[PDB]
């Protein structure tokens, strides 16, 4: 059977994509909230996988597993807000973005089973693209610099804003691990698979000291 090598099966699984620390004390997230832009490549092995192709369409199922750093389950109510592409993210714990109805919010207890939601294909284009040979739209005139190269902006998928419900800081140290699973995958235009280490998240740059895929051999004649 060949169902194990279908694109759907190849990407099918749910992987850790982000960890959110909400400590009692510290410099991390002092205002008891955090904004997490949806990053497909939060899961390590995912980028190289996904970059096997040029264009892709998919749904995303997000699951939210919350606890304290000891794995303890505590009586705390959380809010998972999805800020769609184009909507303004909350800048404070008192920001009015938290109550904007068009930002779908999820209210879960840390007691409840993990929360779970589906995010549709968000792009204004017909497909995401991990490669965009050109400067962002639109042209002309010069434009301003070299810096924007290779950045497609239609891949923006949204943002998850995670906070503890309430006006006062929570009594518990919390960790919110969020998992993503790709549904309904379609892909176009296969590419050679990355054989050099990644350097930056948004470009194919590689080290000027480049390496072989493999090479454990002295001469072509000896196995």
Partner 1 sequence: VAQLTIGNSTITTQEAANIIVGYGEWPSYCSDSDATAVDKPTRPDVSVNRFYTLDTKLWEKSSKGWYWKFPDVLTETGVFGQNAQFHYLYRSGFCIHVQCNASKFHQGALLVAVLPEYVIGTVAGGTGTEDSHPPYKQTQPGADGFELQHPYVLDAGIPISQLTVCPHQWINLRTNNCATIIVPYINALPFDSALNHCNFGLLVVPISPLDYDQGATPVIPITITLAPMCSEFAGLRQ
Partner 2 sequence: GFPTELKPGTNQFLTTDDGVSAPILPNFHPTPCIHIPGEVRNLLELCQVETILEVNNVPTNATSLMERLRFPVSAQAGKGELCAVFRADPGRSGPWQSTLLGQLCGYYTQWSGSLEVTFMFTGSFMATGKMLIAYTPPGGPLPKDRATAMLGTHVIWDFGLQSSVTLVIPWISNTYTTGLVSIWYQTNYVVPIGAPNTAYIIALAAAQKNFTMQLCKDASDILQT
Binding positions for partner 1, rule: CB under 8 A: 54-55, 123, 125-129, 131-140, 146-147, 149-150, 154, 188-196, 198-200, 203-210, 213
Which residue from 27, 45, 70, 168 is in contact with partner 2, where contact means CB under 8 A? Answer: 45
Task: Kindly list the residues in this chain that would bind a second copy in the complex (CB under 8 A).
Answer: 13-16, 43-46, 65, 67-78, 96, 99-102, 104, 107, 109, 111-114, 164-171, 175
Tell me the two tokens of residue 102.
């068009």
State which residue, 6 or 143, has the beta carbon closest to partner 1: 143
166 binds partner 2 (CB under 8 A): no
DSSP H or E run through 48? helix 46-50
Q: Which of 164, 165, 166 is nearest to 23 (CA)?
A: 164
Terminal CA-CA length for the chain: 33
Q: Segment 19-38, which members bind partner 2 (CB under 8 A)? A: none
67 binds partner 2 (CB under 8 A): no
Q: Which option in partner 2, partner 1, a second copy, none does residue 205 bind, with CB closer than 5 to 8 A by kind?
A: partner 1
- Least separation in angstroms between CB 39 and partner 1: 18
State which residue, 89 or 169, has the beta carbon closest to a second copy: 169
> Alpha-carbon distance 197 to 207, whole Å?
7
8 Å CB contact between 119 and 158? yes
State which residue, 41 or 131, has the beta carbon closest to a second copy: 41
Count of residues that bind partner 2 according to CB under 8 A? 96
- C-alpha pair distances (Å), 189 with each of 10, 50, 125, 129, 168: 16, 12, 16, 10, 51
> Alpha-carbon distance 169 to 71, whole Å?
20
125 binds partner 2 (CB under 8 A): yes
> Alpha-carbon distance 61 to 3, whole Å?
21
């Amino acid at each position: 059977s060949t169902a194990e090598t279908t694109l759907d099966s190849f990407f099918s699984r749910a992987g850790l994509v982000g960890e959110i620390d909400l400590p009692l004390e510290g410099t991390t997230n002092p205002n008891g909230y955090a904004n997490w832009d949806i990053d497909i490549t939060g899961y390590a092995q995912m980028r190289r996988k996904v970059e096997l192709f040029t264009y892709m369409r998919f749904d995303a199922e997000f699951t939210f597993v919350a606890c304290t750093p000891t794995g303890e389950v505590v009586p705390q109510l959380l809010q998972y807000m999805f800020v769609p592409p184009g909507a303004p993210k909350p800048d404070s714990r008192e920001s009015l973005a938290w109550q904007t109805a068009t930002n779908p919010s999820v209210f879960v207890k840390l007691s409840d089973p993990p929360a779970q939601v589906s995010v549709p294909f968000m792009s204004p284009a017909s497909a995401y693209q991990w490669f965009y040979d050109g400067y962002p739209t639109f042209g002309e005139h010069k434009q301003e610099k070299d810096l924007e190269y290779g950045a497609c902006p239609n891949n923006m998928m949204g943002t998850f804003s995670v906070r503890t419900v309430g006006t006062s800081k929570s009594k518990y140290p919390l960790v919110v691990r969020i998992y993503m699973r790709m549904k309904h995958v379609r892909a176009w235009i296969p590419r050679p698979m990355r054989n050099q280490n990644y350097l930056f998240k948004a470009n194919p740059n590689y080290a000027g000291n480049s390496i072989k895929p493999t090479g454990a051999s002295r001469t072509a004649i000896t196995t």
